[PDB]
Each structure stands twice: as C-alpha cells, then as structure tokens.
Structure 1
C-alpha cells in the first residue's frame, strides 16, 4: 500500500466521539512496587510458548495428549513443574514488578503524562508513531489516539508496568551452564520467561480490576486471558504498535523501575533480567494491537524533534520501520 504524508495520516486518525465518552478514572494514581510468588503466578502461565521453546508444536493442554510428542511434552511438563516446586519452596527465584497510573491526555501523536490532576506540569511524554500508508476503510492508527485529546477537556489516564521472573535468573542458569547441564539451563530460563509473562498477565488483570478499576467484576479464565478477551491493551515498546525501544527509558523514569525492582536497561534498551516485560496500559474499549509498519522521512524528522534527538539518532532507533533508504 502506497505511502501517505504525515499530515494525511494525521487527518485520518482514529475517529471517536470524545464528547459523549467518559474515560474511566484511575482509582489508584501513583507508583506501587509489587511482587508475586511462584505459587500465585503458576496459575497465570501460558504454557504453549514454553513448549515452543522446546521445539514442540501444538497448544497446551492438547499437546500432552498428542501422539508423536505427547510423551516428551508430558516429561517436559513434569520436569518444569518439579523445578517450579523447588524454586518456590527454596525462594531462589523471586518475581518482582512495579505498576503506575497517571493523569494523561493526547496531544498530536504523543501522550502527555501529568504530575497531578491540575494537568499542567508534564512529568514525561510518551511518544508514538502513526501508520503512514493508504488505509482503506480504517484509521491510520497511533496509540495516542486511544487517549482523550487535551482539547476535549476529558480527564484521562495512562498506566505503565515493568515485571521480571526474578533477578536470580542469571545465577541459576549460569550454574547449570557450569555443570554442562544444558537441559536445565534451558529449563530454568524457560520457566523464568513463563513467570515474567505470567506476571505481566496477572498484573494487567490487577490493573483492569483494581488499580485502574474499570472492570471490577471481570471474571475470565486463564484461557480467556490468553485469548485477550478483556477490555484494553498492554502494548510493549519494541513490539509492532510501538516499535521504538528507547521509550523504555521513559517507563524506567516514570516508575523508578530500577529502584523498585532491580531491573535494568542496556545500551540497546534491552531489559535485564532477560525474563522481563514492560509496557503501557490503555483502557479504551476500541484500543487494539496493530503494526505501525513503514514510515517516511517527514515522520522520522518530526519524531526526532519531539524526542530531542537528531535525525541520525532516530534513523538508528527506527531502522526496521524506515520506508526509505
């Protein structure tokens, strides 16, 4: 599909009657350190990516009864849960996280995040990109579109989070490495990954039901959570609706992530521990995932201005999304 100008894309933003809508008010404004036990998180694990890591095809639980890999799958599942039992009893891998909710409003392709409900002083800006090709019967989406425009005068909110399967991951994996035990090195890293993703799922439910509080009576099964049968999204920097990784630095500042969790960012803006998830929370009922995809030089240069970066810097961070050489 052919490219459009930045202005043409913005003229085709997500269309919504903000005058008739009351964005749900965040019940708990502020930043809260959290933790979750392995016992708590194991009921929020999505096991299917675990089997994928072990190069086995099929959806859990059906994979256990499969005819070619079911026996192997059952053995992997037993070893995994045996290791979860031990990590749990010995408290040797300890999931940690932090959550925050803030007053927020959209301005253009960005989301202003305010110190307080006066909505004057901006403590941070969450910057977003916009789809920039010809859209047939649909908006040129930008994640900012799911927050009320400041011009509408509607009180709106944004959340963020960072969670990890635990700071101990490297020590446990490295010890299996020193033992030449590649099986259990793979296993403990796969389990840390499951616990991080389970914590992201559990904490998102906590946010919808309690911290933000717009779905207090939600009652979804784990399978329904895996199918994303809830209202709102938790998009993560680096993923297709917000591919620009340096926005993780804004999450780290907003939530004081390292102070509250021990989690760190690298020079490439990768998270440490490896088993880590971070992202935003959007409440809007029409919010959804999509791909920004390829963008043009006008949007790159505008993003650079808004970020305080040179055009050269932004072309490094957005290299995979450049629709030009």
Structure 2
C-alpha cells in the first residue's frame, strides 16, 4: 500500500523552525577547488572494511571485520599479506606522486518549497528573487507500521521553508582520485594482476577517504556548524557526527539525473575534470559526490516504492515527460509500467 501524495505530505517531517537553532551561514558563497590535495593526510581516514571484500577476504565471527580479520586463522595470514602490500604500494604511490587527488566544494542558500529545494544567489532575497537551481526531492510514500511514529521523510524537510522567513543553506561536493586508470593499464600490460586489482581498490579507498576528510573539514572549518566537534575516526565511521551528505542515485534520492544540476551549477567539469558519462556515472570511477545537509535532525532514509501519482507530480515539477521519469526512476516504481 502507498499513501496518496496529498496525505503523505501532511504526515511529513515537520520541524518548528522558529525555536530550533538558526542555521549557520557558511564561510563563503560559491565554490572552492582543491587541486593537488595531500594524499598522505587521507591515509588515516581510509575505511579498510570494503577493501578486504575486493579480494573476498571474509572472516568468521567474532573476527568478522577489520581489524579483527588479522586474527582469523582462515584468512588472517592472507589478509595480513594483502594489507601490508597495500600499505607498501600506497607509500610508493604517495611518495612518487603518481596519483593526484582533486575535488571541489561549494555552498549556496537554500529554501524548500513543497518537495523542492530551491537554491538562490548570494545577494538575492529568497522571497523576492528567482532561484538558480532546484533539487526536486522525492517523498516517502509507502505506508508505515501502524504503531510507527516515524514521519514520511523528504530531503526538503531538512531545509527551512521559504515562507518561514528563516534563511537556510545547502552545500555540495565532488572529489576524485586521478591516475588509477593509467596505472591499471601499466600493471596489465606488464602482466601483473595483483597490482592491477590492488591499485584500483586503493583508488576507491582513497576516494572514499577523501570524501570523509572533506566532510569532516566542512563540518568544522568551512561551514563551521560543528566547531565544537572533536570526534575521532572510529566515531565518524559510526555516524556519530551530525548532518548528512546524501548522493544522487542513493535511497535518499534515487534519481540519477540530479547530478546534471550539480555539474551545471558548481561547474565541476572545468574545475576538477570529473565527467558525467551518458549513463550519468562519474568518470574516473574513483569519484564521490553529494550534497551537504547541516540540520541537527537530518538523517539518512530510503524513499522506497512510490505510486503513480507522485511519479506524474514529479514529471510535472521537473517539466519532463512521464515516459522519462519512469525510465530514470525505474527500480523504485511501485506500479506496473506497461
């Protein structure tokens, strides 16, 4: 069962904006580019759990995960060998300056109207000016448990609405780890499958670590809405921090076409060289992007299956045909398509 959109909107995540702490204006409006980001600093943020699954190294309970994996006698020797070789190659890559990190971050004012999150210019009054970009959110529509107290979340519920007079802000980021594509070819031309796999796994790990480090810097020094936070990485990986960085295509907003707005607005192509292919996937493959939400009560959620009324409302909002929304939102349609 799916609730009607007109009723699912009423039971949304309502917040009292006039008593909640008013949002902090970031340190700049526009974008700032990181050209040759220090890769050595990112090594302390690398999440090694997904790295072991590239080689399908899985340990049994209770050693089922990094760094307990070194103890399990089934894989522990091989896990240690792979990890030590990864550290050796990582040191060689950073020392030789083969890989070159690159990224971009930016902030703009944001005001939510219904399920949209309209961004505005720096000096433009939100209530008396046109927006410069829009991020059309999707609201949860699936009916919840009878005893559930959860609201029907949408990404626009985390931005103060236009009528309340309170000014909110939104930021977005894009990071990449260039140079992996050439090194994989180099290690495959000379007959080295171990190095070819390892360099791509390390590139993915470095991209994720760059994303984590940039978010931690944003929360504390660029946006400064958590200036009193001094959390360690073992807490950052546990989502103990506040605020979220959802990415297009993920269960918060499964619409992959949203990346076009980000690339158009932040000028990611000219700033960093991270491209979007005809499938709307970042190139190189070791790239991460997303939007920064600074609300205290913001949390990750899954939109889930949606009904046809929301699909047509979304098509009307985005000014595209239904036959295209059904394409780009294919996996989440809750109704028969043909």
Q: TM-score range by the shorter chain?
A: over 0.9
Larger displacement relative to structure 2 (108-117 or 55-64): 55-64
**Which residue is equivalent to 1:300?**
311
Q: Residue 184 of structure 1 is aligned with which of 195, 214, 222?
A: 195
Larger displacement relative to structure 2 (79-88 or 34-43): 34-43
Q: Residue 93 of structure 1 is aligned with which of 99, 104, 110?
A: 99
Structure 2: segments with no counterpart, 5+ residues: 59-63
Q: Distance in 2 between matches of 1:9 and 1:212?
A: 32
Q: Residues 260-312 of structure 1, C-alpha deviation per residue, up to 9 Å, x if partnerless? A: 11100011111101011100000111111111000111111111122221110
- Measured after TM superposition, the shift of residue 66 of structure 1 is 2.3
Give matches, 1:160-171, under 5 Å. 160-166=172-178, 168-171=179-182
Q: Distance in 2 between matches of 1:222 and 1:76?
A: 23
- Measured after TM superposition, the shift of residue 52 of structure 1 is 1.3
Give matches, 1:276-287, under 5 Å. 276-287=287-298
Task: Report if aligned partners of 1:48, 1:60 keep a CA contact under 8 Å in 2.
Answer: yes
- Measured after TM superposition, the shift of residue 28 of structure 1 is 2.3
**Which residue is equivalent to 1:217?**
228
- Measured after TM superposition, the shift of residue 220 of structure 1 is 1.4
Q: Distance in 1 between matches of 2:4 and 2:185?
A: 50
Q: Distance in 2 between matches of 1:239 and 1:177?
A: 32
- Measured after TM superposition, the shift of residue 27 of structure 1 is 2.4
Q: Residues 205-238 of structure 1, C-alpha deviation per residue, up to 9 Å, x if partnerless? A: 1110011110113111111111011010000111
Aligned residues: 323
| SS class of match (1:245) | coil
| SS class of match (2:9) | helix
**Which residue is equivalent to 2:51?**
50
Give matches, 1:87-166, under 5 Å. 87-117=93-123, 118-119=125-126, 120-135=129-144, 136-166=148-178
- Measured after TM superposition, the shift of residue 65 of structure 1 is 2.4
- TM-score normalised by L of structure 1: 0.97
Q: Residue 71 of structure 1 is aligned with which of 68, 73, 77?
A: 77
- Measured after TM superposition, the shift of residue 72 of structure 1 is 0.7
- Measured after TM superposition, the shift of residue 250 of structure 1 is 1.1
**Which residue is equivalent to 2:2?**
3
Runs (4+) of structure 1 moved beyond 6 Å?
Answer: none
Is 1:36 equivalent to 2:45 in the alignment?
no
Larger displacement relative to structure 2 (157-166 or 297-306): 297-306
- Measured after TM superposition, the shift of residue 103 of structure 1 is 0.6
Q: Residues 63-119 of structure 1, C-alpha deviation per residue, up to 9 Å, x if partnerless? A: 122221111111111111111111111111111100001111111101001012422
Structure 1: segments with no counterpart, 5+ residues: none
Is 1:257 equivalent to 2:258 in the alignment?
no
Task: Report if aligned partners of 1:38, 1:84 keep a CA contact under 8 Å in 2.
Answer: no
Q: Distance in 2 between matches of 1:322 and 1:179?
A: 47
Q: Distance in 2 between matches of 1:201 and 1:54?
A: 23
Q: Distance in 1 between matches of 2:65 and 2:234?
A: 11
- TM-score normalised by L of structure 2: 0.93
Is 1:270 equivalent to 2:281 in the alignment?
yes
Q: Distance in 2 between matches of 1:260 and 1:272?
A: 14
Q: Distance in 2 between matches of 1:180 and 1:309?
A: 49
- Measured after TM superposition, the shift of residue 62 of structure 1 is 1.6
Task: Report if aligned partners of 1:63, 1:69 keep a CA contact under 8 Å in 2.
Answer: yes
